[PDB]
């Protein structure tokens, strides 16, 4: 349905987050796996990433994705969104921060989307298991058998059973918006957000709407800027800095809450 994306749009947005084994090293990746939930009886797992699915930049148009490519919420078509543990997982659904897939047993969980210049693949060390139903061990659901009650993640987009809270982003550090104008540190502003800054001796500690050049610092290395924004919220992740604006205990429904079905 459509209103779920319209409570997932209101203030939620992508965010870059720390990611281990991003390819061959550690990343501040745009799609960072956190809190993967493997507990169903068919190897079906739902993972909370840090890049919005479904939502394009104006509506939903449920074939697109949007991620935080630096300082612009860039949207693309979902071309190859792949999930693997030991073999590729046949992903079944995606909504907001969450992917839901049918994975074989493995010892890692790695996801990635294609964009064309880069791969942006993240990986997390999780012990994903294949829990059978009943009193016989399988390693893949069969063609025929008895219909037993099993707890599985519903593919339905909408449910009000459980929520996660959305919190105002912290102060996103950025050193790429400072330069030397003539011989002094100049602080460019992204034209739509105010940037806080801090330099050699303590300076203006609340930021400013427009650009400025500080004479107390002549080297970019000793002054830096925390870009701030209060127009789009994020989900309070353990790998994001909490803002001094300790308010707004918001809400965000979890799409694929567990249900009782037949296996």
């Amino acid at each position, epitope marked *: 349905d459509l209103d779920t994306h319209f409570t997932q749009y209101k203030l939620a947005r992508p965010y870059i987050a720390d990611c281990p084994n991003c390819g061959h090293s550690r990343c501040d990746s745009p799609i960072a796996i956190e809190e993967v939930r493997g507990d169903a009886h068919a190897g079906v797992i739902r993972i909370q990433t840090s890049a919005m699915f479904g939502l394009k*930049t104006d509506g939903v148009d449920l074939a697109y994705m949007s991620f935080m490519n630096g300082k612009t*919420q860039k949207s693309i078509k979902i071309d190859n969104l792949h999930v693997r543990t030991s073999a590729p997982c046949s992903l079944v659904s995606h909504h907001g921060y969450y992917i839901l897939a049918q994975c074989p047993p493995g010892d890692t969980v790695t996801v990635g989307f294609h964009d064309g210049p880069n791969r942006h693949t993240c990986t997390v060390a999780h012990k994903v298991e294949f829990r059978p139903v009943g009193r016989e061990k399988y390693r893949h659901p069969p063609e025929h058998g008895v219909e037993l009650p099993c707890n599985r993640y519903t593919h339905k987009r909408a449910d009000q059973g459980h929520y996660v809270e959305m919190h105002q982003p912290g102060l996103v550090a950025d050193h790429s918006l400072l330069s030397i104008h003539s011989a002094k540190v100049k602080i460019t*502003v992204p034209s739509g957000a105010q940037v806080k800054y801090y330099c050699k001796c303590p300076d203006v500690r609340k930021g400013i709407t427009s650009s400025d050049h500080t004479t107390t610092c002549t080297d970019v290395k000793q002054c830096r800027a925390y870009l701030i924004d209060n*127009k789009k919220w994020v989900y309070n992740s353990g790998r994001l800095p909490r803002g001094e604006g300790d308010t707004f205990k918001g809400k965000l429904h979890v799409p694929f809450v567990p249900v009782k079905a037949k296996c």
Partner: antibody, heavy 122, light 112 residues
Framework: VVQLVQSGAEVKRPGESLRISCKTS????????INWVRQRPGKGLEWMGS????????RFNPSFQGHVTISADKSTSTTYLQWSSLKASDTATYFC???????????????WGPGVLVTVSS | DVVMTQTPLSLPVTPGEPASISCRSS???????????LHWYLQKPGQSPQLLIY???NRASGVPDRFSGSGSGTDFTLTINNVEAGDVGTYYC?????????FGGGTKVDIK
């Protein structure tokens, strides 16, 4: 479909006030920048200002302080462009345009209004 | 403040062959993450302008495959693979990186 609509074209005299309005429809989020731009007769456009609907955060051109004011209303999802004392140089088309939030930047103006024509002569 | 320049200030052309328009800015529009903050708008005579290309290279909705954007750093180029009669009007390159965000001087494309 999304529709952006402004008030009709108007003729005014110098020295009085004026308020034109631009209304958004077919798009039910308030996480939007709505902005004003002036095209003079036969000359190009000049970005004049921008306002974010949610927090009423302003972004002014340095050539239009005091002369002009931009405000917003949540319930009707409208932006008001207000002039206190129109001048002989305010004869132009004014377009209200829509730029959805995309990072920390004003973005791209995907849909524009029909365009009001405000003329002040002597 | 940044100043934008368009070349040519007017472009006569017939349907059937491509067209190019080069916009230029005082300083680079790129970021450390490699993303261009340009927007190419088209205004046909009579009605309001409409967004034609966004992001400098990315393509806005509704417009045809025909048009294209390219370039880097300070120099950016709009290309039309083959013009039609419908593309008469004014093209405008605009940047966003610094307030005030200013449109270009403009260029006018008309049937020869």
């Amino acid at each position: 479909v999304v529709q952006l609509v402004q008030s009709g074209a108007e003729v005014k005299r110098p020295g009085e006030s004026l308020r034109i309005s631009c209304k958004t429809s077919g798009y039910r989020f308030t996480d939007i920048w709505i902005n004003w731009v002036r095209q003079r007769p036969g000359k190009g456009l000049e970005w004049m200002g921008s306002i974010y609907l949610d927090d009423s955060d302003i972004r002014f051109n340095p050539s239009f302080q005091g002369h002009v004011t931009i405000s917003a209303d949540k319930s009707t999802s409208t932006t008001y462009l207000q002039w206190s004392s129109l001048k002989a140089s305010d004869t132009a088309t004014y377009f209200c345009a829509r730029s959805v939030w995309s990072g920390y930047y004003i973005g791209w103006f995907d849909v524009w209004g029909p365009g009001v024509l405000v003329t002040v002569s002597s | 403040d940044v100043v934008m320049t368009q070349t040519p200030l007017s472009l006569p052309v017939t349907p059937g062959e491509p067209a190019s328009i080069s916009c230029r800015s005082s300083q680079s529009l790129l970021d450390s993450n490699g993303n261009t903050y340009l927007h190419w708008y088209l205004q046909k005579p009579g009605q309001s302008p409409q967004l034609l290309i966004y992001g400098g290279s990315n393509r806005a909705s509704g417009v045809p495959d025909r048009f294209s954007g390219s370039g880097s750093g300070t120099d950016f180029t709009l290309t039309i693979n083959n013009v039609e009669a419908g593309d008469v009007g004014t093209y405008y390159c605009m940047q966003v990186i610094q307030v005030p965000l200013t449109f270009g001087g403009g260029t006018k494309v008309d049937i020869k």
